[PDB]
Each structure stands twice: as structure tokens, then as C-alpha cells.
Design a binder for this molecule. Structure first.
Ligand code: MG
Ligand code: MG
Ligand code: MG
Ligand code: MG
Ligand code: MG
Ligand code: MG
Ligand code: MG
Ligand code: MG
Ligand code: MG
Ligand code: MG
Ligand code: MG
Ligand code: MG
Ligand code: MG
Ligand code: MG
Ligand code: MG
Length: 74
RNA sequence: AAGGGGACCAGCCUAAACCGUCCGGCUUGUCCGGGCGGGGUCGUGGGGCCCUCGGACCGAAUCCCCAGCCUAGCCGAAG
């Protein structure tokens, strides 16, 4: 049962990682405790749409820095 | 059971793709979901989306009117 970790978890994986666990662990532990959500298609693109923003909104923190590394060093 | 002979005869709407809008959520958006509207309905497969071209007949099982019919009756030959 693939689920999306919402927290860095011991020997399981990092936050945002999609790992496989037994169903009982998912519905009776990981899911009612907020530690993860199930890897449905519905909130699978939710994950792709956040890695997207961060990928863009981080490289923008890089593109603007250069727009001054070129100015000031000159 | 197929097949043959007959009775009757009639075919339709939708889900999904893709658009639009509204509302919700807080994993902030090219986000997810819920509505509603548009789209669409097929087996030679069909539909969606993008290119070129071509630009009125059909018609309900729904509604209206009417005939007809039903719920009383009536005329009716000649000792
Ligand atoms: Mg047979
Ligand atoms: Mg027959
Ligand atoms: Mg919608
Ligand atoms: Mg619809
Ligand atoms: Mg429609
Ligand atoms: Mg249609
Ligand atoms: Mg239609
Ligand atoms: Mg329709
Ligand atoms: Mg048809
Ligand atoms: Mg065939
Ligand atoms: Mg096709
Ligand atoms: Mg008919
Ligand atoms: Mg009909
Ligand atoms: Mg009489
Ligand atoms: Mg008499």
C-alpha cells in the first residue's frame, strides 16, 4: 500500500517520499496520526505540483541573486 | 437453443477525455475536491484535443388542440 510520507520517518523514508507499507500500518497508524497520506492519484499530482513550485521558486531565488552578482562585481 | 412462420415494432439519455463558472480546502496553485453548464455516447470502433476544407432537412415516448370513445339518453315501418 503506497503512501506519501508527510514527515521524515525512521528507516521508512524522507518527507514527500512515496514508500510501501502494509495496509494495517497505514490506516490504523500512519494515517490517523498525520504522519502520511495514501498515494492516490488525486493527491499524487498534488505532490508533483509542489515539487514544481519549489523547483521554480528556488531557482528564482538563484536567478535574482545573479542579477546582482553581475551588477556588484562590476 | 439456433433456425423458420407469425404478433408488435423504436430507439434513447448518460460516465470519462477537454473547456467554463461557482464554492470549499491550506500541501498556495498550471493545486486538490465538490456542484452546475458546455462537450460526448460508438464496434467498420467511437469520442476528446490541434491543422485544411465543406456551412437546411429530420423530429419526440414531452406539451397544446381536435376527431373518436366512455359516463344519461332519443327517433324508429305495418291490422
Ligand atoms: Mg443451438
Ligand atoms: Mg422468428
Ligand atoms: Mg469543476
Ligand atoms: Mg457535466
Ligand atoms: Mg451535458
Ligand atoms: Mg448530445
Ligand atoms: Mg447533449
Ligand atoms: Mg448533454
Ligand atoms: Mg446514437
Ligand atoms: Mg470488428
Ligand atoms: Mg480515433
Ligand atoms: Mg412512439
Ligand atoms: Mg425520449
Ligand atoms: Mg320507440
Ligand atoms: Mg312499433
Amino acid at each position: 500500500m503506497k503512501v506519501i510520507l508527510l514527515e521524515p520517518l525512521e528507516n521508512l523514508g524522507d518527507v514527500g517520499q512515496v514508500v510501501d507499507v502494509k495496509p494495517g500500518y497505514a490506516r490504523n497508524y500512519l494515517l490517523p496520526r498525520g504522519l502520511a497520506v495514501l498515494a492516490t492519484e488525486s493527491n499524487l499530482k498534488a505532490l508533483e505540483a509542489r515539487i514544481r513550485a519549489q523547483a521554480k521558486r528556488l531557482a528564482e531565488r538563484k536567478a535574482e541573486a545573479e542579477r546582482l552578482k553581475e551588477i556588484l562585481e562590476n
